[PDB]
Amino acid sequence: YLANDNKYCVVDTGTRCNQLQFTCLNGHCINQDWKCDNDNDCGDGSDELPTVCAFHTCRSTAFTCGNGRCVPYHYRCDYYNDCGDNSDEAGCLFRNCNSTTEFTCSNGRCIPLSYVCNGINNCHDNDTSDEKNCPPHTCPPDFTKCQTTNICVPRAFLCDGDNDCGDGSDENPIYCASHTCRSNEFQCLSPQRCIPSYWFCDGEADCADGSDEPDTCGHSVNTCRASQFQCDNGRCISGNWVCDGDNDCGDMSDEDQRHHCELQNCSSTQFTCVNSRPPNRRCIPQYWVCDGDADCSDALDELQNCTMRTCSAGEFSCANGRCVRQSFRCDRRNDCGDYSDERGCSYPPCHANQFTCQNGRCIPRFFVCDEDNDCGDGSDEQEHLCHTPEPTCPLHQFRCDNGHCIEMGRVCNHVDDCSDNSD
Amino acid sequence: XNXXX
Amino acid sequence: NFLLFSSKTAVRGIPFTLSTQEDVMVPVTGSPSFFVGIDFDAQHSTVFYSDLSKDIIYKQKIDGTGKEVITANRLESVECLTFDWISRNLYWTDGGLKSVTVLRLADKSRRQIISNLNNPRSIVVHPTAGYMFLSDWFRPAKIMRAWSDGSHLMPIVNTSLGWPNGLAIDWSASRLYWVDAFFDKIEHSTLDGLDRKRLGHVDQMTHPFGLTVFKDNVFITDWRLGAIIRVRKSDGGDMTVIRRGISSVMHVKAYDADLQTGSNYCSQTTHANGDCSHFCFPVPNFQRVCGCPYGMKLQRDQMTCEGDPAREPPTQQCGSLSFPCNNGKCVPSFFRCDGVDDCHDNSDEHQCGVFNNTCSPSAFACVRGGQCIPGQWHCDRQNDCLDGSDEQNCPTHATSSTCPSTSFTCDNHVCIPKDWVCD
Amino acid sequence: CSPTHFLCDNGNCIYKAWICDGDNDCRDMSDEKDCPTQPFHCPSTQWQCPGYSTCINLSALCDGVFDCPNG
Ligand SMILES: *[C@@H]1O[C@H](CO)[C@@H](O[C@@H]2O[C@H](CO)[C@@H](O[C@@H]3O[C@H](CO)[C@@H](O)[C@H](O)[C@@H]3O)[C@H](O)[C@H]2NC(C)=O)[C@H](O)[C@H]1NC(C)=O
Ligand SMILES: *[C@@H]1O[C@H](CO)[C@@H](O)[C@H](O[C@@H]2O[C@H](CO)[C@@H](O)[C@H](O)[C@H]2NC(C)=O)[C@H]1NC(C)=O
Ligand SMILES: *[C@@H]1O[C@H](CO)[C@@H](O)[C@H](O)[C@H]1NC(C)=O
Ligand SMILES: *[C@@H]1O[C@H](CO)[C@@H](O)[C@H](O)[C@H]1NC(C)=O
Ligand SMILES: *[C@H]1O[C@H](CO)[C@H](O)[C@H](O)[C@H]1NC(C)=O
Numbered sequence: 033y034l035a036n037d038n039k040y041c042v043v044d045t046g047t048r049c050n051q052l053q054f055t056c057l058n059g060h061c062i063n064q065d066w067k068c069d070n071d072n073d074c075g076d077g078s079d080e081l082p083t084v085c086a087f088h089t090c091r092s093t094a095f096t097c098g099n100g101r102c103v104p105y106h107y108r109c110d111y112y113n114d115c116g117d118n119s120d121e122a123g124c125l126f127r128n129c130n131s132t133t134e135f136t137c138s139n140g141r142c143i144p145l146s147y148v149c150n151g152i153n154n155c156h157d158n159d160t161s162d163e164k165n166c167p168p169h170t171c172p173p174d175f176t177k178c179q180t181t182n183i184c185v186p187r188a189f190l191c192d193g194d195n196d197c198g199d200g201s202d203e204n205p206i207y208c209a210s211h212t213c214r215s216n217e218f219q220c221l222s223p224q225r226c227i228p229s230y231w232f233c234d235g236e237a238d239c240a241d242g243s244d245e246p247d248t249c250g251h252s253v254n255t256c257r258a259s260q261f262q263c264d265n266g267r268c269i270s271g272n273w274v275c276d277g278d279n280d281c282g283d284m285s286d287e288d289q290r291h292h293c294e295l296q297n298c299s300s301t302q303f304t305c306v307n308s309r310p311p312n313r314r315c316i317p318q319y320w321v322c323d324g325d326a327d328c329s330d331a332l333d334e335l336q337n338c339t340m341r342t343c344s345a346g347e348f349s350c351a352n353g354r355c356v357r358q359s360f361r362c363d364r365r366n367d368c369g370d371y372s373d374e375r376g377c378s379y380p381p382c383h384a385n386q387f388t389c390q391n392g393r394c395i396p397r398f399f400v401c402d403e404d405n406d407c408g409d410g411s412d413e414q415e416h417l418c419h420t421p422e423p424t425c426p427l428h429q430f431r432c433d434n435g436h437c438i439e440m441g442r443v444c445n446h447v448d449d450c451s452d453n454s455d
Numbered sequence: 456x457n458x459x460x
Numbered sequence: 461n462f463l464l465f466s467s468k469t470a471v472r473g474i475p476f477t478l479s480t481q482e483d484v485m486v487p488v489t490g491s492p493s494f495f496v497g498i499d500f501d502a503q504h505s506t507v508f509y510s511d512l513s514k515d516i517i518y519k520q521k522i523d524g525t526g527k528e529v530i531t532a533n534r535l536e537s538v539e540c541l542t543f544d545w546i547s548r549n550l551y552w553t554d555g556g557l558k559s560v561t562v563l564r565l566a567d568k569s570r571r572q573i574i575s576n577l578n579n580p581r582s583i584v585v586h587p588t589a590g591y592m593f594l595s596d597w598f599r600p601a602k603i604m605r606a607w608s609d610g611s612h613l614m615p616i617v618n619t620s621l622g623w624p625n626g627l628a629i630d631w632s633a634s635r636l637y638w639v640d641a642f643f644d645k646i647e648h649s650t651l652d653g654l655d656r657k658r659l660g661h662v663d664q665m666t667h668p669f670g671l672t673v674f675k676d677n678v679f680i681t682d683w684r685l686g687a688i689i690r691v692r693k694s695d696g697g698d699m700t701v702i703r704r705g706i707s708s709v710m711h712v713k714a715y716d717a718d719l720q721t722g723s724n725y726c727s728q729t730t731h732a733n734g735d736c737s738h739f740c741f742p743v744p745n746f747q748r749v750c751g752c753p754y755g756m757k758l759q760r761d762q763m764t765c766e767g768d769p770a771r772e773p774p775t776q777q778c779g780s781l782s783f784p785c786n787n788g789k790c791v792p793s794f795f796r797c798d799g800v801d802d803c804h805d806n807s808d809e810h811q812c813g814v815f816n817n818t819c820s821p822s823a824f825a826c827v828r829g830g831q832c833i834p835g836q837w838h839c840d841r842q843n844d845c846l847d848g849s850d851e852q853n854c855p856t857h858a859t860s861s862t863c864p865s866t867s868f869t870c871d872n873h874v875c876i877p878k879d880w881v882c883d
Numbered sequence: 884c885s886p887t888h889f890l891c892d893n894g895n896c897i898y899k900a901w902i903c904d905g906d907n908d909c910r911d912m913s914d915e916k917d918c919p920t921q922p923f924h925c926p927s928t929q930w931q932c933p934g935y936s937t938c939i940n941l942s943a944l945c946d947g948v949f950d951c952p953n954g
């Protein structure tokens with residue numbers, strides 16, 4: 033179909049796009065300003081071809097480069113070469129600065145001392161003159177030495193389509209050109225920290241990579257391999273990870289169902305809350321035994337052999353001897369372990385916006401009928417309270433099989449008004 | 456009238 | 461800061477406080493005078509004004525040392541001046557031409573941006589915001605806003621309105637104040653014309669003309685009172701009269717060096733006036749757009765200008781039946797060489813009665829030539845002409861005449877009422 | 884309005900000859916904005932060359948110099 037003022041033939045997929053947009057050969061509609069600006073906003077550069085730019089003029093509010101490319105006006109005299117032919121930076125009366133904050137970067141930038149030759153280009157001179165003015169340096173690993181300039185950029189940007197290290201190692205044939213990665217590993221959008229082949233299409237893009245999960249593998253063609261254990265359709269899990277209590281399976285259901293961890297056991301410098309259930313806790317370090325705040329389900333951690341004396345009228349006193357702040361009396365929490373802070377209390381009723389469960393626990397009305405047992409007894413999750421009876425529509429009003437009520441006359445009216453040929 | 460003359 | 465205001469008589473600057481009532485700037489005055497538009501330039505400490513008796517726009521320093529003309533060509537009735545302190549463009553509405561004109565001060569480029577109006581009175585320009593605001597008081601009265609370019613001219617307040625004689629902007633809150641002389645009210649609104657509110661009733665205000673907003677206060681000028689009055693910008697409230705018994709009282713304007721600050725893409729320090737030759741205009745969302753004088757079109761670069769005699773052909777200073785003055789004025793041909801300075805720069809009275817630049821019927825001719833004086837100064841008992849040929853050879857007016865019996869004959873042979881003897 | 888008048892958008896009446904005559908007779912530009920006239924002709928006595936926009940001084944006719952493009 034003749035898109036873009038009848039100049040571009042684009043595939044007729046039916047995705048007609050707005051007058052406030054410029055249609056690409058790939059069907060991508062950038063906003064209408066993103067042509068002839070020497071940014072390849074399509075990626076492919078269809079937006080930047082001479083076919084359009086030789087027969088175009090800029091919006092009155094833009095600056096116009098010597099080569100006829102348009103550019104946003106604020107990019108005039110900004111120490112950046114946005115026109116490519118540097119006319120946006122031509123004839124600008126830049127500010128003078130002194131050696132404490134300048135080395136005379138060619139663009140006219142003033143950059144602080146100790147930021148010159150620091151291992152990283154910051155003045156954005158085209159020849160990397162910020163750093164290459166120092167001959168003797170070669171630096172530590174990870175921050176990788178891109179050839180003859182001393183610059184050291186983390187390996188997170190190498191073989192990536194940006195020559196941002198200035199010196200060519202970032203793209204040139206010491207690596208990259210023959211392969212992205214050794215056969216054991218596979219590419220990423222900017223890291224030369226390549227990913228082993230079984231990492232991609234595992235559940236998470238293992239680096240910045242819009243193909244890792246979306247299209248580098250068959251979605252459903254085959255399972256996780258039997259080398260590792262299935263736990264969600266989007267995730268399989270290696271070994272010990274199924275038992276630790278971490279959200280690893282991505283529905284978090286690892287420590288449950290029936291495969292692992294009904295019990296735990298503690299190593300050195302850890303102590304086990306024996307009188308507890310899986311909903312609370314079953315191992316804590318010595319870093320929390322006989323400390324200032326109860327940890328275990330029954331707060332056994334603070335009793336131990338310690339059995340301290342000092343407690344005053346400034347805190348509520350429990351039966352077992354432990355004390356807590358007055359605010360922690362008559363509430364939803366087992367603060368003292370002994371439940372002395374709760375026994376004998378008289379709870380005032382809940383607020384208007386607060387649903388009340390049969391057991392006396394107040395919950396937000398938003399929490400009602402969200403398929404979560406928010407108060408334990410399941411008062412907020414029950415059949416007839418969380419019910420939406422279907423509309424009657426007793427006569428006329430012939431509803432179709434997809435489950436919505438429509439007029440009786442619409443059926444076999446030769447119009448597909450229902451989900452899938454229901455009428 | 457509102458004419459400035 | 462001081463309160464600048466105009467008149468029939470003179471343009472004066474008075475302190476904002478009533479503790480002292482001594483003029484802060486030397487009054488601007490002429491013998492043939494009627495001063496209706498005013499605005500200031502705090503950078504060079506100059507004041508712009510229009511004299512509706514001479515049809516000339518002047519600029520004069522605060523101390524009055526330096527007075528020059530801005531323009532004197534093709535003006536009919538310049539109702540209001542306004543000055544864009546950042547881009548240095550002077551705008552004015554013309555009641556006779558029914559149009560508004562923009563003029564640059566650095567070079568005398570002139571362009572009639574808006575035309576075909578009915579009764580344009582008040583104009584205010586917002587440099588940082590980019591909008592210009594205008595009022596028309598014809599039967600379907602409206603307040604219109606547009607870009608500084610003069611495009612996007614759309615109505616802003618066109619209902620429940622009649623005779624919107626004056627506009628002002630609250631720079632502190634970005635709200636547009638205006639006065640209505642028909643409904644006798646002050647209203648204010650946002651720059652989009654939304655959230656319109658009406659101030660409290662002001663006691664004796666009944667024909668407001670100009671207003672200005674300064675700090676917490678609105679200063680209104682009222683024609684019927686012949687007075688300048690001040691109220692709070694919130695609800696009016698404690699009306700105070702600032703001056704009493706003016707001849708005719710026209711505009712007020714708040715001179716302020718503080719508000720004439722800031723910058724945009726039209727005043728960047730790094731490059732000239734936003735790279736636009738001739739006019740550059742601020743535009744909303746902090747943009748800028750270039751302009752070109754009459755007879756010149758903007759090129760493909762959208763920044764340089766070239767001559768276009770096809771759409772805007774060149775024009776002479778004025779039509780056939782008239783003499784063009786040096787200052788740009790034009791006068792009917794039969795007022796040249798009459799001894800009266802009609803051009804206000806003595807262009808029309810230069811070199812009269814020599815080399816066939818002949819005297820007009822309104823003069824009397826000096827015997828030996830090289831001068832002319834008004835025919836009213838022939839035989840007037842004053843020796844005007846250098847050689848005394850205007851008072852030589854003058855016969856008496858001792859006619860055969862009488863005086864009415866109701867009247868007394870002066871010894872000078874003029875008649876007066878008989879009741880004016882011995883008064 | 885009378886048949887001999889236009890109706891302006893705002894309800895003013897202006898003469899038939901005054902429609903798009905080059906003046907704001909409607910005072911809302913209705914009579915000018917409606918029908919944009921195309922006066923691309925030589926109404927002058929100046930002599931128009933056949934098929935051209937070119938029109939020339941009447942003295943040209945057989946005066947000895949080819950003045951129209953085809954002479
Ligand atoms: C007096 O002012 C009002 C408000 O400016 C004019 O009414 C019309 O207001 C709408 C905004 O509500 C202006 O924009 C239009 O908006 C609609 C959506 O609501 C949109 O579909 C249109 O395409 C348009 O953008 C509209 O321009 C404006 N009309 C005019 C002619 O300016 C009212 O018209 C004014 N009175 C006179 C005498 O025109
Ligand atoms: C009229 O005024 C001009 C000044 O704008 C003055 O110069 C003319 O004087 C002279 O007139 C002569 C003809 O009478 C002419 O030959 C001569 O060049 C001209 N200028 C000078 C400097 O002598 C005045 N007269 C006319 C007719 O222009
Ligand atoms: C040099 O650096 C000093 C700070 O030590 C600063 O005061 C001065 O303005 C700089 N430039 C020049 C021209 O000396
Ligand atoms: C600046 O950089 C460009 C490429 O980024 C390079 O082609 C050009 O030669 C450089 N300018 C100079 C003067 O070397
Ligand atoms: C140049 O292109 C712009 C953007 O589409 C405008 O259409 C502009 O009007 C064009 N130039 C001229 C002189 O018409």
Ligand SMILES: *[C@H]1O[C@H](CO)[C@H](O)[C@H](O)[C@H]1NC(C)=O
Pocket residue numbers: 533534570754774775776777
């Ligand atoms: C002639 O008139 C036009 C408008 O029709 C312009 O104002 C132009 O600037 C004028 N020329 C001179 C010499 O002032």
Ligand SMILES: *[C@H]1O[C@H](CO)[C@H](O)[C@H](O)[C@H]1NC(C)=O
Pocket residue numbers: 793794816817818819820821
């Ligand atoms: C005299 O001659 C000059 C020639 O420029 C003018 O036409 C002028 O108006 C004339 N005045 C009289 C009285 O003849």
Ligand SMILES: *[C@H]1O[C@H](CO)[C@H](O)[C@H](O)[C@H]1NC(C)=O
Pocket residue numbers: 855856857858859860
């Ligand atoms: C003055 O002129 C008048 C003209 O009406 C008379 O002729 C009169 O006689 C003259 N004055 C003298 C003193 O003779």
Ligand SMILES: *[C@H]1O[C@H](CO)[C@H](O)[C@H](O)[C@H]1NC(C)=O
Pocket residue numbers: 861862863864
């Ligand atoms: C005298 O002259 C005056 C005018 O100056 C009157 O016309 C008056 O009527 C005259 N009286 C006589 C008697 O002629």
Ligand SMILES: [Ca+2]
Pocket residue numbers: 066067068069070071072073074079080
């Ligand atoms: Ca682009």
Ligand SMILES: [Ca+2]
Pocket residue numbers: 107108109110111112113114115120121
């Ligand atoms: Ca730039």
Ligand SMILES: [Ca+2]
Pocket residue numbers: 147148149150151152153154155162163
């Ligand atoms: Ca650096």
Ligand SMILES: [Ca+2]
Pocket residue numbers: 189190191192193194195196197202
């Ligand atoms: Ca890179």
Ligand SMILES: [Ca+2]
Pocket residue numbers: 231232233234235236237238244245
């Ligand atoms: Ca992955």
Ligand SMILES: [Ca+2]
Pocket residue numbers: 273274275276277278279280281286287
């Ligand atoms: Ca886990």
Ligand SMILES: [Ca+2]
Pocket residue numbers: 320321322323324325326327328333334
């Ligand atoms: Ca503890």
Ligand SMILES: [Ca+2]
Pocket residue numbers: 360361362363364365366367368373374
């Ligand atoms: Ca408690």
Ligand SMILES: [Ca+2]
Pocket residue numbers: 399400401402403404405406412413
């Ligand atoms: Ca729930």
Ligand SMILES: [Ca+2]
Pocket residue numbers: 442443444445446447448449450455
């Ligand atoms: Ca149907």
Ligand SMILES: [Ca+2]
Pocket residue numbers: 641642643644666667
């Ligand atoms: Ca009134």
Ligand SMILES: [Ca+2]
Pocket residue numbers: 795796797798799800801802803808809
């Ligand atoms: Ca004169």
